[PDB]
Write a protein that holds these residues in place. Structure first.
Motif, PDB file in Angstrom:
ATOM      1  N   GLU A   1     -46.639   6.989  15.852  1.00  0.00           N
ATOM      2  CA  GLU A   1     -47.277   7.323  14.589  1.00  0.00           C
ATOM      3  C   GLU A   1     -48.638   6.641  14.486  1.00  0.00           C
ATOM      4  OE1 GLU A   1     -44.439   5.745  14.997  1.00  0.00           O
ATOM      5  OE2 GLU A   1     -42.786   6.685  13.902  1.00  0.00           O
ATOM      6  N   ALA A   2     -49.365   6.964  13.420  1.00  0.00           N
ATOM      7  CA  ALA A   2     -50.658   6.337  13.187  1.00  0.00           C
ATOM      8  C   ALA A   2     -50.467   4.858  12.891  1.00  0.00           C
ATOM      9  CB  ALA A   2     -51.380   7.022  12.029  1.00  0.00           C
ATOM     10  N   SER A   3     -51.095   4.011  13.700  1.00  0.00           N
ATOM     11  CA  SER A   3     -50.950   2.565  13.593  1.00  0.00           C
ATOM     12  C   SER A   3     -52.305   1.897  13.473  1.00  0.00           C
ATOM     13  CB  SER A   3     -50.184   2.004  14.785  1.00  0.00           C
ATOM     14  OG  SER A   3     -50.734   2.474  16.000  1.00  0.00           O
ATOM     15  N   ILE A   4     -53.190   2.481  12.689  1.00  0.00           N
ATOM     16  CA  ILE A   4     -54.513   1.922  12.457  1.00  0.00           C
ATOM     17  C   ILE A   4     -54.477   1.131  11.159  1.00  0.00           C
ATOM     18  CG2 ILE A   4     -55.605   3.720  11.079  1.00  0.00           C
ATOM     19  CD1 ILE A   4     -58.000   3.512  12.983  1.00  0.00           C
ATOM     20  N   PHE A   5     -55.373   0.154  11.044  1.00  0.00           N
ATOM     21  CA  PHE A   5     -55.483  -0.638   9.824  1.00  0.00           C
ATOM     22  C   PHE A   5     -56.212   0.203   8.787  1.00  0.00           C
ATOM     23  CE2 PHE A   5     -55.611  -4.735  12.561  1.00  0.00           C
ATOM     24  CZ  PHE A   5     -54.301  -4.523  12.915  1.00  0.00           C
ATOM     25  N   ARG A   6     -55.481   0.658   7.768  1.00  0.00           N
ATOM     26  CA  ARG A   6     -56.020   1.669   6.865  1.00  0.00           C
ATOM     27  C   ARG A   6     -57.228   1.156   6.093  1.00  0.00           C
ATOM     28  NH1 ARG A   6     -50.972   2.895   9.257  1.00  0.00           N
ATOM     29  NH2 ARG A   6     -50.789   5.174   9.172  1.00  0.00           N
ATOM     30  N   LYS A   7     -57.168  -0.081   5.604  1.00  0.00           N
ATOM     31  CA  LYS A   7     -58.216  -0.635   4.758  1.00  0.00           C
ATOM     32  C   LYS A   7     -59.158  -1.558   5.523  1.00  0.00           C
ATOM     33  CE  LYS A   7     -55.108  -0.400   0.823  1.00  0.00           C
ATOM     34  NZ  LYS A   7     -56.154  -0.378  -0.236  1.00  0.00           N
TER      35      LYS A   7
ATOM     36  N   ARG B   1     -58.748  -0.624  20.388  1.00  0.00           N
ATOM     37  CA  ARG B   1     -58.139  -1.833  19.847  1.00  0.00           C
ATOM     38  C   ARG B   1     -57.105  -2.403  20.808  1.00  0.00           C
ATOM     39  NH1 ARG B   1     -55.046  -0.533  14.686  1.00  0.00           N
ATOM     40  NH2 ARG B   1     -53.391  -0.192  16.226  1.00  0.00           N
TER      41      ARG B   1
ATOM     42  N   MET C   1     -62.359  -6.107  16.194  1.00  0.00           N
ATOM     43  CA  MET C   1     -62.643  -7.535  16.167  1.00  0.00           C
ATOM     44  C   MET C   1     -61.445  -8.359  15.714  1.00  0.00           C
ATOM     45  SD  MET C   1     -64.721  -9.983  16.745  1.00  0.00           S
ATOM     46  CE  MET C   1     -66.388  -9.361  16.890  1.00  0.00           C
ATOM     47  N   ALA C   2     -60.559  -7.797  14.890  1.00  0.00           N
ATOM     48  CA  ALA C   2     -59.371  -8.533  14.481  1.00  0.00           C
ATOM     49  C   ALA C   2     -58.459  -8.841  15.656  1.00  0.00           C
ATOM     50  CB  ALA C   2     -58.602  -7.747  13.421  1.00  0.00           C
ATOM     51  N   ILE C   3     -58.627  -8.144  16.777  1.00  0.00           N
ATOM     52  CA  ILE C   3     -57.838  -8.389  17.976  1.00  0.00           C
ATOM     53  C   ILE C   3     -58.686  -9.142  18.990  1.00  0.00           C
ATOM     54  CG2 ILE C   3     -56.271  -7.357  19.639  1.00  0.00           C
ATOM     55  CD1 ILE C   3     -55.438  -6.798  16.861  1.00  0.00           C
TER      56      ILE C   3
ATOM     57  N   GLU D   1     -60.686 -11.443  18.191  1.00  0.00           N
ATOM     58  CA  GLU D   1     -60.752 -12.827  17.741  1.00  0.00           C
ATOM     59  C   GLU D   1     -59.565 -13.653  18.210  1.00  0.00           C
ATOM     60  OE1 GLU D   1     -61.243 -12.381  13.563  1.00  0.00           O
ATOM     61  OE2 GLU D   1     -63.389 -12.827  13.596  1.00  0.00           O
TER      62      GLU D   1
ATOM     63  N   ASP E   1     -64.024  -3.842  12.486  1.00  0.00           N
ATOM     64  CA  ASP E   1     -63.002  -4.821  12.153  1.00  0.00           C
ATOM     65  C   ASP E   1     -61.678  -4.548  12.849  1.00  0.00           C
ATOM     66  OD1 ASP E   1     -64.890  -6.004  10.619  1.00  0.00           O
ATOM     67  OD2 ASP E   1     -63.893  -5.690   8.689  1.00  0.00           O
TER      68      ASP E   1
ATOM     69  N   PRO F   1     -47.627   2.661  19.435  1.00  0.00           N
ATOM     70  CA  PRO F   1     -46.579   3.453  18.784  1.00  0.00           C
ATOM     71  C   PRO F   1     -47.013   4.892  18.551  1.00  0.00           C
ATOM     72  CG  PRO F   1     -47.606   1.967  17.228  1.00  0.00           C
ATOM     73  CD  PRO F   1     -48.097   1.564  18.577  1.00  0.00           C
TER      74      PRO F   1
END
Ligand SMILES: CCCCCCCCCCCCCCCCCC(=O)OC[C@H](COP(=O)(O)OCCN)OC(=O)CCCCCCCCCCCCCCCCC
Ligand SMILES: CCCCCCCCCCCCCCCCCC(=O)OC[C@H](COP(=O)(O)OCCN)OC(=O)CCCCCCCCCCCCCCCCC
Ligand SMILES: CCCCCCCCCCCCCCCCCC(=O)OC[C@H](COP(=O)(O)OCCN)OC(=O)CCCCCCCCCCCCCCCCC
Ligand SMILES: CCCCCCCCCCCCCCCCCC(=O)OC[C@H](COP(=O)(O)OCCN)OC(=O)CCCCCCCCCCCCCCCCC
Lengths: 239, 354, 353, 240
Positions: free
Chosen positions: D86-92, D150, D100-102, D104, D97, D84
């Protein structure tokens, strides 16, 4: 007339984003305000417009210091402002967008307002669309109606905000025509934009600002041939 | 500035009217659900609907200070999020003129609120709470809960229902002396006020000799209980103090002042119905302050949610501070003055920071 | 497994915050209700803290499902608005897997409420009532006597002169009619632990009542005052304090319906998640907040439809077997339909092609 | 060597025909740009290819696999990524991670395989030194590198970037271009839609111009910059 912003400075929460920025806009002179997005460029632009209160420095329209006046007094001394987003009165006709602002002017009587409305409708070629609601206007005519509305307030300097943002490569030739028309009246247009190619083309003097400081100034040639700007903003391969 | 005033004015006025329509609408529904619990026998679902409906004018008058808040929020945010207020400010129009432009329709709104809450709400509420009182409880001596009790040292009395024209219904009275011979008892039927004394009809006063004799009931259609309570006082006492008109509240307050009884509960309602325009003005000033500040760029949902949350806190405060004037001795005027003043001060501060 | 303890952390934090706010609001409302009766003098202005401390479990159990509902809505709307879920879907994460990730905290919030409903609320409701019987104006509030009649109306509460002494009043008017105590005079021989009952030197205890137009003859009585206790009557029947075990095998309909009401809140937590994962989705324009209010009305409808059916079950109208179980069904189906609306629409599309 | 074959697409909003009979095709190792006037069907065509908008006619067919009626997680399990604007990064979450969250979710890897893939993706994009910084404390440049790493962690065949050159400095695009060139080198085919004609026409290899729903021109930059119709309706008479 001259709009001198002198020794501007502003500190956000903790850090300081603007440090000793000094611009000078004259009448009938297009001036561009450019720089990296992270640096303080929109902050300086807003501090000139009036939405953001500076911490130091003065803003003077020809020995008429308005550094403390709100946007009300800044606009009453004469300063335009055109938002990037659509700001047309959606439920008001085109002949009423201009008139709702002409009624604010005090020096005009009943006949003077009608004459001014006729002149403004004829100047910007929206005379045949004088009975269309604002929500019924396309992108091409909306900008013309907004510019006519801005001139209805009789300003001295109009401070455009992102004029070439998200427009087709064929509508910039019309926006530049409108800007030339505004300059031909004796207005001090100030353009801030992320589009370097067209802003450096239309403008006559650009103020590249980085890290809340002026790093360069001058015409297009003296900006595209500098070294700090090529290092930080434009990159060595920019044209 | 005529065209702009009409555009800011029509927009806030249509929105306040739409929000009051949804709020009067939900509230009448939550009320029907509650009434359904007691619809039994005498009360029928159709009759309950007359009470839920004829109590509408009062429910609206109460919600005008909340409807005005939420409607101002919505109808000014629909102009602020379209960037149609920065244009007005950059054309030379001050914030004071925008506030006055918003206030001009609202001044008519509060005038209409005063007129309705003084001339329409008491009449419709009285009709509703007389019809329901008649229906739910005409038949038995102690069954009705809309009945009125009065106190004398010798005797204690219950009247089941009252009607505005004069007709009265269902009275049971027990008269006890320290000696208290159970000579007579009281249960009664219709009592059209008959000159000075209410005529208890079809009384089954239970007549007995306490130590050793039988009890017999004697019914007289002309039997009379004289009036400690007169008819008008009877209209006022049964009515909730909030449902009385201002011209009626003043008379009842001064009447209670003459007799030495405490009227502090009747001052709070008077102040609430009199200072309501100032409370609406404070709420809408705070709403305009919110629009120019934190809620300038938020969406419609956030504005509606913010409005409800602040509105709830206000009402609950006015309900903490209201009946606390009797528990703790401080003037009841502060109960209505304080929250509106706090809202106005917060709005003024947030407008000053801009 | 990293997304699992991301969506099971933000949801929990938002649920905690929303539950705290809702608890504050409900406590304030119940406080306004109780404060007024005290202004009338019917309650102890000084005993308004113990009651609010003992009534926490009921409010908390009725709030926590709403807390989870709003927490899921807000957290997932925030993720949708920041494009943190568009890239989760664009990598392989299903919508039946989001539900599996979301039903992990919904199992802890459904153990907390299943404990508050079965082992904590009954004890709180029991002590709160005990304190009313321990006190409830046990001493000196009989009412300068202002006429007072009980909501039940069986018992009328009064004294000749708001006598704090409440002793040897010329008229003691604690009179309880069905057989009614009638007190010629009431000596204040009271303060029994179970309830205050006061010896009348002479108490008629004249059972016959003029309400039925009947007089029955009885003479002197002692320890007359019964329990004219208004607040317990207002909100507590023993059913609300009876232990759960006692509810188990009973044939009283009320006891059977209460077990069904008690174990009807753990199940609400689950039905509510199925309705929040599907509706959490938001365009950037609509925002996290537009639907939070429509949701509250649906939750309230859930609680009220069930309450109404509980009453019908103890009135003999609806067979116990069917129970409140149907109400959960209507909500599970409204919930399934919101969930599979989208796949269904697309599958219909496959056929039209 | 796969292929994306969005063909005979069509969609209508409230009666009017926004898009009508547009046909596109992307290969593996190929950069294709989708451009056009703002009011045309460029964005609609891009979204119907991605899967956020359901088309009324036509079929999207990745390597003989009808993905038209699939949700946007069966499209992405067939090898169609998406990024997308806009910014679509996991902020926290940390960068490690974020990847690795993808990683996994992959069923083709084991613990050692996932760890080695994470190390490879972390060293390939030169983000190994920010492997522990939270996603909310990343600059505008490293954020895009983390997002693209990612997206590659799911091993797609086509990444459909949306407005990559959006509000970025002229010095920044020199890096987005290198990232896109790396993606092309790996084998992923990229589809780019943007409002900035010069940069997109420079980076891409075959551009499709969409006006009034239908295609009006196709081909490389030279054949697009010298066409009368696009110079009459899109680029004007003074572009380059
Ligand atoms: C005994 C009397 C009993 C009366 C009971 C009345 C109960 C009503 C319960 C249902 C109310 C539903 C209202 C729904 C409103 C929300 C829906 C909506 O979106 O409304 C928008 C609408 C827009 O307005 P529009 O028609 O476009 O006008 C523009 C003119 N230029 O906005 C509107 O104009 C429509 C909404 C109008 C709302 C009217 C109701 C609120 C105001 C009256 C309150 C009741 C007063 C009672 C006392 C009366 C005394 C005589
Ligand atoms: C989305 C969720 C929507 C949830 C709606 C919840 C509605 C809850 C209504 C509760 C009504 C109630 O509690 O009162 C009980 C009362 C029973 O009365 P009834 O059965 O008619 O018998 C008495 C006279 N012989 O009344 C009844 O239960 C029977 C009559 C019901 C009439 C319709 C009620 C509609 C309420 C608004 C919706
Ligand atoms: C009690 C609960 C009340 C909850 C009220 C929540 C209001 C939230 C509005 C949005 C807050 C926000 O967006 O934060 C940003 C804002 C700073 O932004 P800016 O002011 O532009 O600088 O930060 C703010 O300026 C926050 C300002 C909050 C003002 C709240 C005033 C509430 C008044 C309640 C009156 C109640 C009367 C009875 C008691
Ligand atoms: C009562 C007074 C309590 C006083 C102490 C607590 C005050 C808390 C007030 C919070 C208000 C926050 C707010 O209005 O702004 C929206 C908030 C922040 O939004 P932002 O960060 O800008 O992101 C977009 O977005 C949020 O994340 C809000 C999360 C906090 C929870 C807000 C309240 C949720 C519950 C609302 C209940 C409303 C009343 C319901 C009544 C019926 C209940 C059955």
């Amino acid at each position: 007339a001259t709009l001198k912003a002198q020794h501007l400075a502003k500190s956000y929460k903790g850090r300081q984003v603007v440090r000793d920025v000094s611009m000078s806009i004259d009448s009938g002179q297009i001036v561009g305000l450019l720089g990296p997005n992270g640096a303080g460029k929109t902050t300086c632009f807003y501090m000139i417009v009036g939405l953001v209160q500076a911490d130091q420095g003065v803003v003077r329209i020809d020995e008429q210091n308005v550094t403390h006046l709100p946007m009300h007094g800044r606009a009453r001394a004469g300063i335009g402002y055109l938002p990037q987003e659509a700001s047309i009165f959606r439920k008001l006709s085109v002949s009423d967008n201009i008139m709702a602002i002409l009624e604010t002017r005090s020096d005009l009587d009943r006949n003077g307002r009608k004459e001014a409305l006729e002149g403004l409708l004829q100047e910007f070629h929206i005379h045949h669309i004088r009975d269309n609601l604002g929500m019924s206007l396309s992108g091409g005519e909306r900008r013309r109606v907004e510019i006519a509305r801005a001139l209805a307030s009789a300003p001295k300097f109009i401070l455009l905000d992102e004029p070439f943002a998200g427009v087709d490569p064929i509508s910039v030739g019309d926006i530049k025509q409108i800007i030339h028309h505004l300059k031909a009246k004796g207005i001090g247009i100030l353009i801030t934009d992320h589009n370097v190619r067209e802003t450096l083309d239309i403008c006559e003097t650009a103020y590249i600002v980085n890290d809340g400081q002026l790093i360069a100034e001058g015409d297009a040639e003296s900006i595209l041939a500098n070294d700090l700007v090529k290092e930080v903003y434009l990159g060595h391969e920019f044209r | 500035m005529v065209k702009l005033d009409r555009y800011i004015g029509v927009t806030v006025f249509v929105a306040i009217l739409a929000v009051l329509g949804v709020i009067l609408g939900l509230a009448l529904l939550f009320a029907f659900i509650d009434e359904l619990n007691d619809i039994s026998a005498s009360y029928g679902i159709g009759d309950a609907l007359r009470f839920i409906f004829l109590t509408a004018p009062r429910r609206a008058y109460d919600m005008l200070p909340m409807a005005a808040l939420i409607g101002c929020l919505v109808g000014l945010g629909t102009l602020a999020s379209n960037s149609e207020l920065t244009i007005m400010r950059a054309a030379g129009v001050s914030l004071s003129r925008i506030v006055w432009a918003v206030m001009k329709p609202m001044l008519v709104l509060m005038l209409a609120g005063i007129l309705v809450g003084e001339y329409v709400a008491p009449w419709t509420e009285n009709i509703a709470q007389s019809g329901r009182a008649l229906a739910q409880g005409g038949g038995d001596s102690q069954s009705s809960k809309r009945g009125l009790w009065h106190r004398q040292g010798r005797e204690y009395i219950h009247i089941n229902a009252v009607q505005p024209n004069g007709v009265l219904y269902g009275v049971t009275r027990y008269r006890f002396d320290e000696q208290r011979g159970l000579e007579s008892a009281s249960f009664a039927k219709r009592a059209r006020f008959e000159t000075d004394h209410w005529q208890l009809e079809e009384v089954t006063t239970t007549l007995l000799h306490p130590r050793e004799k039988r009890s017999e009931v004697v019914k007289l259609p002309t039997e009379r209980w004289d009036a400690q309570l007169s008819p008008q006082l009877l209209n006022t006492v049964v009515m909730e103090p909030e449902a009385l008109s201002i011209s009626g509240l003043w008379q009842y307050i001064h009447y209670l002042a003459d007799q030495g009884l405490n009227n502090n509960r009747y001052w709070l309602a008077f102040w609430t119905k009199v200072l309501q325009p100032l409370v609406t003005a404070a709420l809408v000033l705070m709403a305009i302050s919110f629009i120019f500040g934190p809620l300038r760029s938020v969406t419609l949902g956030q504005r509606i949610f913010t409005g409800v949350l602040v509105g709830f806190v206000f009402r609950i405060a006015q309900d903490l501070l209201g009946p606390s004037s009797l528990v703790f001795d401080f003037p009841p005027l502060l109960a209505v003055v304080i929250p509106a003043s706090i809202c106005a001060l917060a709005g003024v501060w947030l407008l000053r920071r801009a | 497994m990293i997304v699992f303890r991301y969506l099971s952390r933000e949801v929990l934090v938002t649920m905690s915050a929303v539950s705290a706010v809702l608890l504050v609001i409900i406590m304030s409302g119940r406080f306004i209700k109780y404060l007024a009766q005290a202004a009338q003098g019917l309650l102890d202005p000084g005993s308004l803290f113990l009651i609010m401390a003992f009534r926490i479990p009921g409010f908390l159990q009725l709030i926590l499902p709403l807390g989870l509902f709003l927490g899921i809505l807000l957290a997932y709307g925030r993720l949708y608005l920041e494009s943190e879920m568009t890239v989760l879907s664009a990598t392989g994460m299903s919508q039946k897997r989001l539900l599996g990730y979301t039903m992990a905290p919904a199992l802890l919030v459904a153990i907390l409420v299943a404990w508050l409903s079965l082992f904590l609320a009954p004890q709180g409701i029991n002590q709160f009532a005990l304190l009313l019987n321990k006190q409830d104006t046990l001493t000196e509030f009989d009412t300068p006597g202002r006429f007072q009649a009980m909501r039940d109306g069986t018992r009328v509460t009064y004294t000749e002169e708001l006598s704090k002494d409440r002793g040897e009043l010329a008229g003691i008017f604690i009179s309880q009619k069905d057989s009614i105590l009638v007190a010629e005079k009431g000596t204040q021989n009271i303060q029994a632990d179970g309830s205050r009952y006061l010896i009348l030197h002479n108490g008629y205890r004249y059972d016959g009542n003029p309400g039925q137009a009947n007089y029955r003859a009885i003479q002197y009585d002692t320890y007359g005052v019964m329990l004219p206790k208004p607040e317990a009557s207002s909100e507590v029947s023993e059913r609300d304090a009876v232990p759960t075990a006692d509810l188990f095998g009973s044939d009283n309909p009320r006891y059977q319906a209460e077990l069904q009401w008690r174990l009807s809140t753990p199940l609400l937590v689950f039905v509510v998640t199925l309705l929040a994962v599907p509706l959490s989705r938001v365009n950037p324009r609509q925002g996290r907040f537009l639907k939070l209010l429509p949701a509250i009305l649906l939750y309230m409808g859930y609680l009220a439809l069930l309450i109404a059916v509980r009453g019908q079950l103890d009135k003999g109208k609806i067979p116990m077997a069917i129970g409140l179980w149907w109400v959960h069904g209507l909500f599970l189906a409204i919930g399934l339909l919101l969930f599979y609306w989208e796949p269904l629409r697309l599958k219909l599309a496959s056929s039209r092609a």
